[PDB]
Design a protein around this ligand. Structure first.
Ligand code: 4QG
Length: 284
């Protein structure tokens, strides 16, 4: 029932595009009556697209209520004249402290402390576990899709169409080749992506960042599992990276297994890390 969706006129205001265009037509929005912020995903909707759109709303209503997923608020339809085309606004939680990509880029030497990596990675894994239990694959885990609220809460965004995006966080099994002709996403594909995101937090960029995207896409299923460049890291972090980045997804551990891994499981400085992150956020 899309006919019941209200016009957003004096309920939500569009401020500006959020980020720069990583998310596309996603806006910084304001609740008119309170001044509260929201992230507004905007899309042109045709008569045939109506059925596919209904399933998106339902997914957000059921799965976004976990603390490691940005909350869904509601939907609006800005009806255009009979000469088409209507706009659909999906209003979600605004994560003011921005992405994990921004967090590494704003940090001296473009590297995060190991205890920060463990905390963020665990929160990613906790969000993935909620999705996987409900038979949902995120399909796009990367630093830009992991956001921080003003209270250092870690939240996942943009889970699941004519364009292929960035290849750098893609698991080998999602890239079709002669051996793997029918490339398909598995729940374990999100675990590889989590591992690449952990390397991104550690080095400021994913593994084949210096390659043309088409060359990286060719190299991912052919190259051995990527490794951390520095030897400074603990034996537990190298082990976590090794766990995430098992080449063949069939021997790759589950989200439940990775949540029990010593690097994720053993976090005594958890309380201090949350304060440390909150302090970095306070410095706008
Ligand atoms: N200023 C910033 O860097 C910044 C960047 C991003 C955000 C943000 N909050 C929620 C979302 C979101 C993104 C994609 C989707 Cl699909 C849904 C929600 O993005 C806030 C601030």
């Amino acid at each position: 029932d899309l006919s019941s969706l209200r016009d957003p006129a004096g309920i939500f205001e569009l401020v500006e595009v959020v980020g720069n265009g990583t998310y596309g037509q996603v806006y910084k929005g304001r609740h008119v009556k309170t001044g509260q912020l929201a992230a507004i995903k905007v899309m042109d909707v045709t008569e045939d697209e109506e059925e596919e759109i209904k399933l998106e709303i339902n997914m957000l209503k059921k799965y976004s209520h976990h603390r490691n997923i940005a909350t869904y608020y509601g939907a609006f339809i800005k009806k255009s004249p009979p000469g088409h085309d209507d706009q659909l606004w999906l209003v979600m939680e605004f994560c003011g402290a921005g992405s994990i990509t921004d967090l590494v880029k704003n940090t001296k030497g473009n590297t995060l402390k190991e205890d920060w990596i463990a905390y963020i990675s665990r929160e990613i894994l906790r969000g993935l576990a909620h999705l996987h239990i409900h038979h949902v694959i995120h399909r796009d885990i990367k630093g830009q899709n992991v956001l921080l609220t003003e209270n250092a809460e870690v939240k996942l965004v943009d889970f699941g169409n004519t364009f292929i995006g960035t290849p750098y966080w893609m698991a080998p099994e999602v890239i079709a080749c002669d051996e793997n002709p029918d490339a398909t996403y598995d729940y374990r594909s999100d675990l590889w992506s989590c591992g690449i995101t952990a390397i991104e937090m550690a080095e400021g960029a994913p593994p084949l960042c210096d390659m043309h995207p088409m060359r990286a896409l060719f190299l991912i299923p052919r190259n051995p599992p990527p490794r951390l460049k520095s030897k400074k890291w603990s034996k537990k972090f190298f082990s976590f990276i090794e766990g995430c980045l098992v080449k063949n997804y069939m021997q790759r551990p589950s989200t439940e297994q990775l949540l029990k891994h010593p690097f994720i499981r053993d976090q005594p400085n958890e309380r201090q890390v949350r304060i440390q992150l909150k302090d970095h956020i306070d410095r706008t």
